[model samples]
Target: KITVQANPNMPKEVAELFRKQHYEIVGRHSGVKLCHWLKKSLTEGRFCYKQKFYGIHSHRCLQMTPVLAWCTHNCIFCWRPMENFLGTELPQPWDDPAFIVEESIKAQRKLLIGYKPKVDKKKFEEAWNPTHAAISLSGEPMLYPYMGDLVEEFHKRGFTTFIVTNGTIPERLEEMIKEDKLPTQLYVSITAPDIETYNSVNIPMIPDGWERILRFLELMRDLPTRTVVRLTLVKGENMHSPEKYAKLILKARPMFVEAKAYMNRLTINNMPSHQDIREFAEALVKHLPGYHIEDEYEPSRVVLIMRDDVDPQGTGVEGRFIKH
Candidate 1:
């Protein structure tokens, strides 16, 4: 039996677009690419906030999106051209989890091959052996039907997985929790402070998208895995109402909350300055009692707020890799 269907029914134009961007197509819907940050760490000694906050080595991170072209939201601040690929359903004849895992690793390794000559020998070797999989490269990963199985496959292969979803799919998250197939870390992108703002910012396809996000937050309160609510604050757009944002944060009570500045390069001119993000995070801190500014990576324009009960020292270099 064919374990995977490569680009089944995928529009040739869509596939071509991704290919132009150096995305290695996986199965029917997934794609893997080497992150610029991953290359930067190896070449320039620069690292992402994952290294500062969670000890995840930037060089060892395999950045990918399983459901590459299937997304429900068209956020204005999204770096990807969401208008090009906005669908509410998964593609037919989905690829097997095992096939996707094996193929994705192969694709990732292929991308790393070119870096062998340019990067330091030891770093190049480590880059060849990626230990973590970040399923947040482009589309909504939760929309992938076999998300639970995908996570399990990565775990089985000794790869710690981190999944990011726009909180529009609560049922899928609940299912993952029930099946005990959650990723090492789960992130829900909180784009706005209120439902009206959300509708404007996210430009959601589903009519009940806002309501679903509320439900997702409630579900996160009880999830067994590590949870994070990421606030992508656009300058003049959804940047108002810090207290309102805090109200939602209080409800979900995520282990960590990231207040990050939106990096806008196109028509959206509302990208916040580094100082603006710091101030916004400070304003948010006033409303949150247990949460405090644990660490800040100024270069990334992001600040990490950790719960008082969670030990920041304990997070250092320990439990960073998947067991081999």
Candidate 2:
């Protein structure tokens, strides 16, 4: 059942392994649902926005990826099941922009099929209306050669693009700026401030990844998109000092800083205790003064946001942050 496509970007070994796993080659390039498999459920309307944030709606999201599946870091806390490895490799060159866009729309239509019965006509139709395209999926999308072009295509189609990168490729970010096609928001996942802890937590293949990440953050400071430096705090592992994390944030100069709790996924059963998760998140907020609480949901066991800018609306706390 193994099948591999000559994806120019992915390594041959990775593609070979993927083929062995019986993963179908995806052939879509643009609108929202990037792959057919995802479109099946999404167009069928079976998907739910499990995580809701203030002022953000679930249906407005268009989940997609430049690569089908690949990642350089086998993070200890990854929730999704790993199929094959496509680490630090370029995306498979299969389809063009028009094909990607048309397929995405068609796939989305199919994905919304299941929801036809449950949702009202207006709401269901609204769900199919794509507002944002999130490029954060199973793989590092920056590895795709035409990533900037892809973003441009998404933007041209009237979709707000959210580009999430692991900071493994700074050159891509730079190129994005040069091409003047940077996303609406740029996110850099800052797992750990120090090298030893980062390597332990992220399990990244590339050495000195932390240094590279820091440099990328520095570059993000000058970029147009609202820069976000996301810090995933694991209790005993990386939450050693609030000062260290603060220093990294200061160095990066991001518009917003998200200090999120590291969830205890199957891969990383040895995650931080719940009590420690709350303590670390609370401590980090205290150490950093500018950030204020955004919102949170108890069921997801996750908090919302900590924005460097004050909440002008004066919304009260919902658990994510505590003002100093």
Candidate 3:
């Protein structure tokens, strides 16, 4: 039922908002930036939780999004600059997938150029060529019409990509599965355990946000790539219900569930402590069938829960890492 419409490129003011924060905007829609962990990895020999939980080389990861200005929801916990949020869908004459993939890498390189003089020569050189693309910098990246093509392009360039979405469109993931263009990891955020909380917290632009998320969870039950259900735990909010979150998560039956804390910024103040996340994870483990707490990253204040099913060897966290 969705139809493409004609429109102009990204607005000048919106582009400036990102540029002021050092985001390298690409094409008419996409943007790229070096993440804090990536810098820490390069300068302090530290890595992001993704490296330990999923084996993403932090320094070698390009954090970017194709639809920088368009978002389905304006989440309170989200750190992205969404002031003057664009429409949900991209207009006709969309940016080429190949161009985005190529230019995104270039964008990352441009951001990293200054770091060359500050970090180890070998690490700096490796960063020039990213091995992973986290297509999750801003907005609901799943809104991109040519998502499958985008993933295919990145795969063609030898990237193990990750896509983080608000789960407003289940059909998009279905499309990727059918086309065999899935990313290395697919993250669907669950900011609330119930619709009421979802309404207040995520502030979904679409009226049927909760329903679509329910459908998306049902679809996640059998995704081919690594599927993860992420809970953005906010103190005195969605973090209240452990079993309630468990009920929704059971629908997805994800390979892993991350009960990560919401980093409080701006005026909204309800950040959960690492201890809170640990206690919640313990309670959540009781309700989550066939899943156990494999590990926890103190720096990130997130706990990782893995499904019990294993190969003939009965692998655990060892199986989480990607073969580089």
Supply the TM-score for candidate 2. 0.74
Candidate 2, residues 1-324: lDDT per residue as tens digits?
222222334445654554454333346322233333233333455332222443333465666666666666767665323443445564444466544544555545555553554344554566577666777755677777677887878778877667777888888878878888787667788777677777878888777677777778778764655566777766566778777787777666665566566663334544555555566667766766667545544433444445545353433232221111
1-324 per-residue lDDT for model 3 (tens digits): 211121226777766778888888887778888986777678778878987877677888889998887888877777765453677676556788998888787778777866654577788888888888898898788888889999989989988888999899888988988888888888998989877888878877888889989999998887777789999898876787789999999999988899998773334457788898999999999998789998899889999988877322232323566755
Where model 3 places Cα greater than 4 Å from the true spot, the runs are: 1-8, 264-269, 310-318
- Worst 10-residue lDDT window, candidate 1: 315-324
lDDT of 1 by residue, 1-324 (tens): 112236634768767777778888888878889986777778877778878778778788889988888778877766563344558877777888999889898888877766654567788788788889899998788898889999999989888889999989999988898888989888999988987898788888889988888999999895676778999988778899999999888879888899998873334468788899899999999999988998889888999888777766664212222223
Q: What's the alpha carbon RMSD for model 3?
A: 4.8
**Shift of residue 280 alpha carbon in model 1, Å:** 0.4
TM-score of 1: 0.93
Steric overlap count per candidate: 0, 17, 0
Question: Native-vs-model 2 lDDT?
Answer: 0.59
Give the per-residue Cα lDDT of candidate 3 at 211. Answer: 90
Candidate 3: give the clashing pairs.
none
Q: The CA-based lDDT of model 3 is what?
A: 0.81
